[PDB]
Amino acid sequence: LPSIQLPVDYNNLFNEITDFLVTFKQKGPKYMAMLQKVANRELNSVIIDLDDILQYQNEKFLQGTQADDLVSAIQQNANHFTELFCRAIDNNMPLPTKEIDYKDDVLDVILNQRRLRNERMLSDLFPPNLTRRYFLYFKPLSQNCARRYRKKAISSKPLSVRQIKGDFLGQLITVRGIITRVSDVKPAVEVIAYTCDQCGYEVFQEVNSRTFTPLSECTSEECSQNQTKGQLFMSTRASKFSAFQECKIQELSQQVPVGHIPRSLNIHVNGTLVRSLSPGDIVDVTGIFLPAPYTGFKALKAGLLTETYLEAQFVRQHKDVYNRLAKSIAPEIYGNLDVKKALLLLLVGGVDKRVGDGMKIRGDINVCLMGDPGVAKSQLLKAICKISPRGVYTTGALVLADNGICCIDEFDKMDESDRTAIHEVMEQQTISISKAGINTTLNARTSILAAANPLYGRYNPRLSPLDNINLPAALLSRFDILFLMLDIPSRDDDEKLAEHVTYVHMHNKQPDLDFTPVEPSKMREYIAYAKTKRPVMSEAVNDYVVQAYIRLRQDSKREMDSKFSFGQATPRTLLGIIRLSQALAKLRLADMVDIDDVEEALRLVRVSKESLYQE
Amino acid sequence: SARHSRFGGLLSIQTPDKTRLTVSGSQALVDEKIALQKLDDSK
Amino acid sequence: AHALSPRTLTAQHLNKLVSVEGIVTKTSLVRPKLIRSVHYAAKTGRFHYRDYTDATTTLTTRIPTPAIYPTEDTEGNKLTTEYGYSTFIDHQRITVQEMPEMAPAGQLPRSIDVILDDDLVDKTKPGDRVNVVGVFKSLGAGGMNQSNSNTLIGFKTLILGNTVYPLARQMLTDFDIRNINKLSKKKDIFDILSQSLAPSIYGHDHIKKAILLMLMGGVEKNLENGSHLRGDINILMVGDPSTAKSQLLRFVLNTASLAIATTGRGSSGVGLTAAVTTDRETGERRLEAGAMVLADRGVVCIDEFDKMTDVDRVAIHEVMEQQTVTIAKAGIHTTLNARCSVIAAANPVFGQYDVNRDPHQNIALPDSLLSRFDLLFVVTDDINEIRDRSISEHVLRTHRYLPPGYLEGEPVRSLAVGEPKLVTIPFLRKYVQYAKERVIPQLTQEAINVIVKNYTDLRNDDNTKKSPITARTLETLIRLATAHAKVRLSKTVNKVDAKVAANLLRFALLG
DNA sequence: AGCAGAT
DNA sequence: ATCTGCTTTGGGTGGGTGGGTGGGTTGAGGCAATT
Ligand SMILES: Nc1ncnc2c1ncn2[C@@H]1O[C@H](COP(=O)(O)OP(=O)(O)OP(=O)(O)O)[C@@H](O)[C@H]1O
Ligand SMILES: Nc1ncnc2c1ncn2[C@@H]1O[C@H](COP(=O)(O)OP(=O)(O)OP(=O)(O)O)[C@@H](O)[C@H]1O
Ligand SMILES: [Mg+2]
Ligand SMILES: [Mg+2]
Ligand SMILES: [Zn+2]
């Protein structure tokens, strides 16, 4: 084992660390106050801000007493400095200020008895990590502070998984990506506490590897002197465990080069950082890039190739009312007022579902868009699905949409299995799984928003709607509102659409200037507020809706006498009308459902289909 | 022991002098003759 | 004589410096490799180190060193590893395959394994043409150890690379740039460049113009809200047998900087998107890019588009619709980028286009899949006297070509590694590269008026169209105008570009 | 390297 | 108490006279039954 002479002495660095902890100020010293809080059992996590270390270094330099570069040393080799700082804190932990129940703690009693036994033996200990009740983390060097003092911050500079190469091992770096998998928290053993069934003593073993070999024979002085063979046994009550969690971080789409596939990197989280990462978040993880040596035979076989991981140390997470809301739903298309109004009604989904007689009327308004290719169906779906909090976008996922609107594109193509699944959902509002491996039943009170094309690919006026639609007639009937959007050539409308699209392509902004769209956040919060509300209905409104129902049934029967009618009205239509009225009242924020809401709902159902069919 | 073998009850018996020995078993947790018998048998 | 190929590498060349050419077919994941470890003895206050070697990290044989980190000093002191001062290097293994066109008769191409360390780690991706220089070696005991009872297995072999030389982008000179500009100042540059494409195919002027605009491409715009407008041009050719569709596909394959070849019955849904396999080096689950992913930012030529299956058609539908690939298999969730232009050729349902029957009955592809092609060209073989004489004379002239360096009746069969007139193919490639590398045209109100007028007139017109007018036609018009502006090396789209795009679309739709 | 056996 | 000796991980640098109720799980291609 030859030796080298590196230009680093850990004694001056340790002295600098102690001076920084005891003297630095930014009241009393910041880190001494934090240690005071740690001693009183209030705090259990000490975060070292490299910005503070840089500031302390520059203050010392200004005073003229230049010292060693602590920040660069920490960044270049960070594993050693965790232990160095922990030792420094252990040396300077202040006495507690608030009395605590020492006897309640198992470790206090055990160590007191160990002290008593050692005193008795003398009249004729335990690793430092065992008594530690805090975790130490490094906060990277912020970009602004590095620029303020004319320095380069490697730690806070973001990297992709691709840029993290084999020469970065052992440093303090940052990674940018989206988390794809987070494991469950579990106990990782740091110090193991044994007991002797003969000597009555306790042994401690330190573990800093994936595996270890437990002790089986007493090593106490009494056992060796007496030669008594007392077996050692584990005790989980006295050991020390640290919360452990393993995550995975993947490259962002914009970071992968051309004609390549994304890569992923493991992350280890220990201490109080657990549960700070979940799948789907875009984060800037700061950690120590270390290898993971194999053990035993696997080490011999594996050769010199090494697995790697990141020890998480800091995580940064990234971020007239009706007409206004409708026009603001999607400003990049040409206005479809009726469709947008119906979609908003779907989004709010107001309903009073408390029958309590065995089952209740469905508490979701379902909307279907059917139109010849060319109209903005996919754009409407994408917008309505982004706005919603629970929106789930799929192509012909349901679990994610539970208690929310479901965004199904290409509904007609869908396979019979999914058609049966949705048929079950609408009727029963339940997800049922019957498998030998698992049997889990989940409720699903979720709304469906579908988009489909006619049978022949375009609407044929000669054939009636029913024949144009491939889906079962029962499924169409179950829909609360069915919208049929058609693409009719016309000089004026075509010119307007062309001007709109072309302005959008040239300038990258909305062309309209007559009105200003409402901010999306305001619309979302108002929608949530409306969902929170609950309206009510009287007897007079009940009579009015009943009269409307008989009128609609007579008209629908007369229409069904011919083949043009989509389908004769049914009690489902009455339930849908009252559901729409309730949602409209929710938007109005009034308990008492006005006749105006019912009239507007009637107009909406009429214009859903007849307005365009009669054209 | 009424409970299963892995229940995991640990004991600390005090000798006439201030030293504590460790015994395992619910019967030991209850009784002292059983504790001494186990101490002898575990040798 | 050391310039070889994976087929010609034999045991005679072991322990020698060789240069090998081929296609990269596989590429393992990059994993650091331990070389030196540095420790610190706290009590003694001195650092120690250890040096590790392997069969693939050096050229001279040494005793193997297991990767176990020293724990105790010579005198028994405790040692703490200093990772920040240790030395690890990257390590990757690739496979280079013999060029298929250079293989013998009736033999599948062979391949050799290569190792790249340190700065040669990520210089190649699958589907790249490379020339690798290294030392040909052998490893292991090769069955001489008593554990293996075979007695008929040879030694492992592979190349430790020293250099990697690409064989994709042309380096432009000042003379080339000035020539490109001078040519671009001409008023009929579009016609010259279009005619220069595939000089040996008679006619098909408009298809050649469309192929040129496809090679140039459009301008890709992504909006803040999330809408992502593609700037790629897709082309579909449907026609009667023996109309030069496949030869046009092959010419596009040869000219384009990046192009992947696929057919209908030879491909599969997985083979187009990506496959789940295991890495030999590390034994880790990963994805292998497919035809569509490998052709990212390029072109994919699909022959016999109508002979595919619906299950395999769905993958292409998704790729063309979104321009990405979403994968959910074997506990893998990701989104691969596939931004490619699709040029395809298909045959009508009855093998020959019928004028009487409507276009829907003549083509078996779904309407949704059809709406994703910018230009649909229907080509028919109409028998005529003048046309037949012209085409036959052209074919006869073509068949009489003799390559320089050969005698009559002679059947047809490197030196260093480091290194109205038709425009030659190399200059065409240079022109396309320059234009699509440093021109980003922007629309202008005049082109805007032209485009809106053309769309308005086209949609509401009595005359029937071989394809149905839609709002997508507007995007196609803008894309074609932008590509034509690229052809002239202009920063703005003018009236002329709009009028050219309109004429091309009108020919495509109404013959 | 940990454990299973013969002198 | 010391000296002598075998075998892993999991994987094709053990195999198919050990098999797949001992785990290594997608991809392609052929066949019967279903259509
Ligand atoms: N009113 C409109 N204003 C602006 N752009 C529109 C409008 N209607 C349609 N479009 C454009 O039409 C193009 C095609 O629309 P989209 O993909 O949403 O539906 P579709 O083509 O009918 O659907 P499908 O994929 O089911 O055939 C989109 O680019 C959209 O921008
Ligand atoms: N215009 C043309 N000029 C020269 N050769 C031509 C022309 N049209 C067809 N050919 C000849 O056609 C032969 C084969 O036809 P090709 O494969 O190009 O047709 P295709 O449209 O792909 O047919 P298929 O429907 O059978 O796939 C080629 O050898 C080419 O010489
Ligand atoms: Mg769509
Ligand atoms: Mg062909
Ligand atoms: Zn003991």
XYZ file of C-alpha atoms in Angstrom, chain A residues 114-489:
376
model
C -23.197 0.071 31.384
C -21.524 2.927 33.264
C -22.397 1.284 36.585
C -20.960 -2.053 35.445
C -17.755 -0.407 34.212
C -17.400 1.432 37.526
C -17.845 -1.829 39.435
C -15.270 -3.577 37.240
C -12.766 -0.759 37.763
C -13.346 -0.832 41.527
C -12.326 -4.512 41.536
C -17.980 2.265 25.189
C -20.742 2.540 22.493
C -20.191 3.945 18.948
C -20.940 7.736 18.615
C -23.653 7.018 16.038
C -25.718 5.091 18.595
C -26.585 8.152 20.691
C -27.002 10.550 17.757
C -30.585 11.771 17.344
C -30.052 13.975 14.285
C -29.170 13.723 10.602
C -26.749 16.011 8.765
C -27.284 17.272 5.216
C -25.466 19.657 2.880
C -27.315 22.446 1.101
C -25.530 23.164 -2.207
C -23.879 26.449 -3.192
C -26.584 28.711 -4.602
C -25.923 30.253 -8.005
C -26.616 33.829 -6.902
C -24.287 33.602 -3.900
C -21.536 32.066 -6.033
C -21.881 34.906 -8.544
C -21.879 37.474 -5.726
C -18.457 36.293 -4.510
C -17.024 35.546 -7.987
C -16.989 31.756 -7.785
C -18.352 28.813 -9.766
C -20.939 26.542 -8.130
C -20.569 22.982 -9.399
C -22.884 21.606 -6.712
C -25.893 23.742 -7.680
C -25.315 23.521 -11.434
C -27.963 21.113 -12.776
C -26.948 18.023 -14.719
C -28.792 15.388 -16.696
C -28.316 11.701 -15.978
C -26.232 11.604 -19.193
C -23.707 14.199 -17.971
C -23.132 12.408 -14.639
C -20.044 10.448 -15.682
C -17.578 8.212 -13.852
C -15.255 11.076 -12.910
C -17.965 12.774 -10.819
C -17.930 9.926 -8.283
C -17.399 11.112 -4.723
C -18.606 14.689 -5.281
C -21.623 16.814 -4.345
C -23.656 17.325 -7.525
C -27.207 18.076 -8.664
C -29.448 16.117 -11.036
C -32.505 17.245 -13.008
C -35.213 14.815 -14.048
C -38.601 13.325 -13.231
C -39.011 10.642 -10.578
C -40.375 7.401 -12.027
C -40.424 5.108 -8.973
C -40.280 5.518 -5.190
C -40.062 2.514 -2.877
C -41.762 2.143 0.489
C -40.007 3.392 3.608
C -38.292 0.641 5.589
C -35.790 0.383 8.467
C -32.105 0.238 7.531
C -29.883 -0.900 10.389
C -26.967 1.301 11.471
C -25.929 -0.151 14.853
C -26.933 -3.603 16.122
C -27.297 -4.248 19.857
C -26.724 -7.778 21.159
C -27.093 -9.351 24.600
C -25.306 -12.130 26.489
C -27.456 -14.781 28.154
C -24.647 -15.601 30.626
C -22.485 -12.525 31.217
C -25.379 -10.062 31.257
C -23.498 -7.591 29.038
C -24.389 -5.908 25.744
C -22.371 -5.661 22.529
C -22.631 -3.172 19.674
C -21.763 -3.702 16.012
C -21.673 -1.077 13.266
C -23.074 -1.817 9.804
C -22.143 0.286 6.769
C -22.779 -2.210 3.971
C -25.621 -3.977 2.199
C -24.886 -7.118 4.240
C -23.175 -8.156 7.463
C -22.324 -11.228 9.529
C -23.999 -11.313 12.970
C -22.012 -12.068 16.098
C -22.557 -15.478 17.684
C -20.113 -15.598 20.634
C -19.678 -13.189 23.526
C -16.645 -10.897 23.406
C -17.137 -9.275 26.819
C -14.202 -9.124 29.216
C -16.032 -11.221 31.813
C -16.815 -13.985 29.313
C -13.240 -14.176 28.018
C -11.696 -14.095 31.500
C -14.126 -16.752 32.749
C -14.049 -18.524 29.334
C -17.831 -19.019 29.626
C -19.349 -19.533 26.172
C -22.388 -17.256 26.137
C -24.254 -16.963 22.861
C -24.970 -13.466 21.562
C -28.493 -12.684 20.373
C -29.929 -9.723 18.501
C -32.276 -7.182 20.079
C -34.251 -4.842 17.828
C -35.450 -2.699 20.744
C -31.945 -1.345 21.426
C -30.570 -1.163 17.873
C -30.505 2.041 15.818
C -32.500 2.233 12.585
C -32.685 4.946 9.937
C -35.605 5.358 7.561
C -34.571 4.145 4.107
C -36.147 4.740 0.710
C -34.945 4.050 -2.834
C -36.065 6.159 -5.796
C -35.364 6.364 -9.522
C -34.766 9.506 -11.587
C -35.110 9.593 -15.375
C -34.010 12.086 -18.002
C -36.405 14.725 -19.249
C -37.577 14.487 -22.847
C -35.764 17.690 -23.833
C -32.414 16.410 -22.494
C -32.081 13.162 -24.475
C -30.017 13.617 -27.682
C -31.360 12.841 -31.154
C -31.939 9.155 -31.829
C -31.272 8.073 -28.236
C -33.222 6.559 -25.347
C -33.459 8.074 -21.840
C -31.415 6.767 -18.924
C -32.174 6.478 -15.215
C -30.190 6.801 -11.993
C -30.791 5.382 -8.523
C -31.256 7.602 -5.469
C -30.925 6.699 -1.787
C -32.821 8.753 0.804
C -32.038 8.387 4.512
C -33.203 10.146 7.650
C -35.768 12.941 7.503
C -35.592 13.341 3.708
C -37.837 10.314 3.162
C -41.309 10.842 1.677
C -40.072 14.050 0.008
C -40.107 12.443 -3.463
C -43.045 10.933 -5.341
C -43.357 9.594 -8.897
C -44.049 12.267 -11.492
C -42.361 15.257 -9.842
C -39.689 17.227 -11.701
C -36.979 17.873 -9.118
C -33.397 19.064 -8.667
C -31.949 16.381 -6.396
C -28.667 17.304 -4.707
C -26.640 14.424 -3.333
C -23.331 12.608 -3.055
C -22.488 10.401 -6.039
C -21.037 7.178 -4.615
C -20.430 3.617 -5.807
C -22.151 0.536 -4.384
C -19.478 -2.151 -3.969
C -20.606 -5.750 -4.210
C -19.881 -8.242 -1.434
C -18.665 -11.814 -1.218
C -18.662 -13.932 -4.356
C -20.646 -11.400 -6.387
C -17.798 -8.927 -5.876
C -15.313 -11.443 -7.282
C -17.489 -12.215 -10.308
C -18.531 -8.641 -11.102
C -15.006 -7.526 -12.011
C -14.236 -3.800 -11.888
C -17.635 -2.542 -13.069
C -19.465 -0.778 -10.245
C -23.043 0.212 -9.560
C -23.643 3.809 -8.517
C -26.300 5.779 -6.670
C -26.975 9.230 -5.231
C -27.305 10.035 -1.520
C -30.092 12.605 -1.448
C -29.183 15.730 0.521
C -31.522 18.461 -0.785
C -34.574 18.442 -3.057
C -36.045 21.400 -4.954
C -39.537 20.883 -6.367
C -40.703 22.668 -9.507
C -44.102 24.313 -9.877
C -71.864 37.063 -18.045
C -69.669 34.590 -16.162
C -70.892 31.665 -18.273
C -69.860 33.277 -21.560
C -66.494 34.412 -20.193
C -65.628 30.967 -18.832
C -66.761 29.260 -22.036
C -64.737 31.566 -24.281
C -61.728 31.166 -21.961
C -61.858 27.347 -21.918
C -59.821 27.150 -25.150
C -58.969 30.459 -26.849
C -56.838 28.913 -29.629
C -59.825 27.424 -31.477
C -62.730 29.129 -33.212
C -65.552 29.689 -30.752
C -68.087 26.911 -30.078
C -70.267 28.504 -27.411
C -72.753 25.659 -26.937
C -70.090 22.945 -26.751
C -68.014 24.974 -24.292
C -71.061 25.645 -22.110
C -71.891 21.935 -22.038
C -68.275 21.069 -21.225
C -68.246 23.551 -18.335
C -71.462 21.997 -17.035
C -69.744 18.609 -17.246
C -66.742 19.993 -15.364
C -68.803 21.305 -12.456
C -71.049 18.236 -12.408
C -73.474 19.575 -9.826
C -75.868 16.947 -8.494
C -77.830 16.047 -5.348
C -77.340 12.275 -5.059
C -78.823 11.200 -1.715
C -81.741 8.929 -2.637
C -80.829 6.533 0.167
C -83.535 4.070 -0.918
C -81.134 1.365 -2.126
C -79.392 3.311 -4.877
C -79.180 6.882 -6.140
C -79.381 8.747 -9.431
C -76.001 9.012 -11.136
C -74.039 11.998 -9.880
C -72.085 12.871 -13.024
C -72.950 14.621 -16.289
C -71.511 12.754 -19.277
C -70.689 14.522 -22.545
C -69.970 13.025 -25.968
C -68.454 14.835 -28.949
C -69.046 13.243 -32.355
C -67.977 15.010 -35.525
C -66.433 14.438 -38.962
C -62.602 14.702 -38.891
C -61.379 18.330 -39.138
C -63.099 19.923 -36.163
C -61.204 20.552 -32.924
C -62.135 17.427 -30.994
C -58.667 16.449 -29.776
C -57.833 20.051 -28.860
C -61.066 20.390 -26.887
C -60.335 17.118 -25.095
C -56.773 18.168 -24.253
C -57.855 21.564 -22.927
C -60.798 20.227 -20.913
C -58.516 17.545 -19.491
C -55.709 19.912 -18.505
C -58.122 22.317 -16.794
C -59.705 19.608 -14.660
C -57.840 18.483 -11.521
C -58.628 14.783 -12.081
C -58.662 14.747 -15.895
C -57.165 11.600 -17.436
C -56.375 11.520 -21.162
C -56.458 8.183 -22.986
C -56.811 6.862 -26.528
C -59.078 4.017 -27.581
C -56.248 5.243 -16.481
C -59.850 4.931 -15.321
C -58.644 4.514 -11.730
C -56.858 7.871 -11.880
C -60.140 9.434 -13.052
C -62.174 8.163 -10.085
C -64.438 10.955 -8.823
C -63.446 12.983 -11.878
C -63.983 13.472 -15.584
C -62.397 10.919 -17.925
C -60.948 12.035 -21.268
C -61.370 9.239 -23.825
C -60.220 9.949 -27.382
C -61.124 7.787 -30.382
C -64.080 6.298 -28.524
C -65.475 4.405 -31.522
C -62.322 2.360 -32.164
C -62.215 1.085 -28.579
C -62.258 -2.662 -27.960
C -65.273 -4.523 -26.595
C -63.572 -5.115 -23.236
C -63.198 -1.396 -22.513
C -66.708 -0.749 -23.843
C -68.073 -3.245 -21.317
C -65.916 -1.641 -18.623
C -67.376 1.817 -19.251
C -70.869 0.341 -19.529
C -70.357 -1.103 -16.047
C -68.958 2.197 -14.759
C -71.914 4.276 -15.937
C -74.594 1.911 -14.629
C -72.939 0.866 -11.359
C -70.165 3.462 -10.851
C -67.942 0.617 -9.643
C -64.659 -0.976 -10.705
C -64.621 -4.731 -10.053
C -61.645 -7.071 -10.485
C -62.110 -10.857 -10.286
C -58.748 -12.623 -10.563
C -57.065 -15.462 -8.707
C -54.000 -13.312 -8.071
C -56.009 -10.404 -6.649
C -59.637 -9.537 -5.851
C -60.070 -5.794 -5.260
C -63.267 -3.789 -5.773
C -63.056 -0.010 -6.200
C -65.908 2.461 -6.512
C -65.766 4.762 -9.556
C -68.094 7.776 -9.579
C -66.311 9.326 -12.549
C -67.648 11.194 -15.575
C -66.752 10.289 -19.163
C -65.890 12.692 -21.997
C -65.698 10.825 -25.307
C -64.706 11.715 -28.870
C -65.574 9.561 -31.880
C -65.938 9.588 -35.662
C -68.988 8.373 -37.633
C -69.078 4.876 -39.086
C -67.983 5.859 -42.603
C -65.453 8.403 -41.319
C -67.785 11.334 -42.025
C -71.417 12.129 -41.324
C -73.734 11.041 -44.140
C -76.977 13.075 -44.324
C -78.733 10.254 -46.186
C -78.284 7.887 -43.250
C -79.850 8.821 -39.921
C -77.623 9.492 -36.891
C -78.227 6.083 -35.316
C -76.820 4.259 -38.339
C -73.917 6.721 -38.492
C -72.977 5.897 -34.883
C -71.371 2.484 -34.432
C -71.907 2.422 -30.673
C -74.887 0.612 -29.115
C -78.087 2.627 -28.890
C -78.254 1.966 -25.142
C -74.819 3.544 -24.685
C -75.912 6.653 -26.591
C -79.086 6.851 -24.504
C -77.095 6.631 -21.266
C -75.183 9.775 -22.254
C -76.472 12.907 -20.539
C -75.689 15.188 -23.503
C -74.695 14.005 -26.986
C -73.105 16.675 -29.184
C -72.871 16.308 -32.966
C -70.402 18.745 -34.554
C -70.231 18.962 -38.351
C -67.854 20.608 -40.812
C -69.917 22.574 -43.349
C -67.908 24.533 -45.956
